[PDB]
């Protein structure tokens, strides 16, 4: 199984490399060659979830058989027996093993600095270039630093 | 099994080496050659967790059969029998063996010191370069030291 | 199964490449060669959902057999027994494995900037060029940036 773990590491590294390639394909025309640096971290879960759900519909029952005895005298006896049929959904789901659980991307732009408007524009391009998903916990940093 | 433990050590060292390579790929342009030093510690758990969860939904029951006797005279007798159907989820999860449980990264920058703003900018780049995850217990130190 | 995961990555990359090709086929005449850059992120779910639904119709029952005893004296006894037949739909659905769960497209247009009207017109063309589906969570960014 350790060979499987090794190949999982390979998958994660391949994903990171592909994302880096896309980042380059976007930023190389916009910024130029050597005016930026970017690295990508991709964390992938490899669990084996397998779920079975059996759901009913309480608010729409359908009476199948029914008995109702109601006699008076004073005495009032109200017996009743009822059998129901209910909407039944049975869903069996099997999640894919390796899923990107969190994605971190950081891009540093060489100074000569960059204005806030262009930094936010680059961030907007990256959002969509990488597939930024904040609800997944992903993080995207864009900074303007001084290259040596 | 000790061979398996040896290969687990190899996996941990490989992960550390990959993270060091990424750190270099980010900092070598920004800082230069020989102006920084960085080391990475990665601790990986290799447990064999395997969980089975059976969850219900108490607040939405669906009545399947029902009996209700209610007679009066004074005397008031209220018998009742009820059978329910409930939402049932059965999920079987099997966690991946080797998972990074804690990650420690330390970077030291050669003086001539570095301002706090640039130190924090480098820290921001590393956050995303390495995939910093504070909730996991990870730690990232960036210091400005005097190289000899 | 890791080979299957690799081929899933290949499928996702192929989809992204096809969408990029369509984007080029639309924007190359309109904008020109080298006046734009665009990248596409496609996230695909590969679950194995398999659902079975059994639905009834509570509001249109059909009486199959019926007994009704109603005697008087004063005393009033109203016994009743009833059997019903109900509309029964049984649908077994099996979803396709790989489905595009979210799609992100970002396009950056070289300045010399672009007016808001033409930006929105390009966005309208892309909506339909790519098959924009906001209800799916898809995202489409169109920006006017300064190419270097």
């Amino acid at each position: 199984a350790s060979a499987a773990r090794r190949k999982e590491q390979e998958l994660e590294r391949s994903q990171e490399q592909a994302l880096r390639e896309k980042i380059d394909s976007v930023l190389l025309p916009i910024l130029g060659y050597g005016n930026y640096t970017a690295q990508v971290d991709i964390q992938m879960d490899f669990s084996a979830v397998e779920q079975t759900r059996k759901r009913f519909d309480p608010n729409t029952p359908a009476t199948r058989s029914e008995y109702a005895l109601e006699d008076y005298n004073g005495s009032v006896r109200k017996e009743s027996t009822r059998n129901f049929e209910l909407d039944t959904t049975i869903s069996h789901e099997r999640k894919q093993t390796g899923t990107v659980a969190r994605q971190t991307v950081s891009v540093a732009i060489k100074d000569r600095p960059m204005s806030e408007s262009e930094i936010n524009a680059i961030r907007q391009v990256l959002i969509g270039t990488v597939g930024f998903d904040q609800g997944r916990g992903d993080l995207l940093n864009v900074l303007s630093v001084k290259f040596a | 099994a000790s061979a398996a433990r040896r290969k687990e050590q190899e996996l941990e060292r490989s992960q550390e080496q990959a993270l060091r390579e990424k750190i270099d790929s980010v900092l070598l342009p920004i800082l230069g050659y020989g102006n920084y030093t960085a080391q990475v510690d990665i601790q990986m758990d290799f447990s064999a967790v395997e969980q089975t969860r059976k969850r219900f939904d108490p607040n939405t029951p669906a009545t399947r059969s029902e009996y209700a006797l209610e007679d009066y005279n004074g005397s008031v007798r209220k018998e009742s029998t009820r059978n329910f159907e409930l939402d049932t989820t059965i999920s079987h999860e099997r966690k991946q063996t080797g998972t990074v449980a804690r990650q420690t990264v330390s970077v030291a920058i050669k003086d001539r010191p570095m301002s706090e703003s640039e130190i924090n900018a480098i820290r921001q780049v590393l956050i995303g370069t390495v995939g910093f995850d504070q909730g996991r217990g990870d730690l990232l130190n960036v210091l400005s030291v005097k190289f000899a | 199964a890791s080979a299957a995961r690799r081929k899933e990555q290949e499928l996702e990359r192929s989809q992204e490449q096809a969408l990029r090709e369509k984007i080029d086929s639309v924007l190359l005449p309109i904008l020109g060669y080298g006046n734009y850059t665009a990248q596409v992120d496609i996230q695909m779910d590969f679950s194995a959902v398999e659902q079975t639904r059994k639905r009834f119709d509570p509001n249109t029952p059909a009486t199959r057999s019926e007994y009704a005893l109603e005697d008087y004296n004063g005393s009033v006894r109203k016994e009743s027994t009833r059997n019903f037949e109900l509309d029964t739909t049984i649908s077994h659905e099996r979803k396709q494995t790989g489905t595009v769960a979210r799609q992100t497209v970002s396009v950056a247009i070289k300045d010399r900037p672009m007016s808001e009207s033409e930006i929105n017109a390009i966005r309208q063309v892309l909506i339909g060029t790519v098959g924009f589906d906001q209800g799916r969570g898809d995202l489409l960014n169109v920006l006017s940036v300064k190419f270097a």
Binding site: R64, S65, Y67, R82, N83, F84 | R64, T81, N83 | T81
Partner: peptide, 9 residues
Amino acid sequence: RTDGRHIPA
């Protein structure tokens, strides 16, 4: 007339 239930015609 159904599953675990009553209504014993």
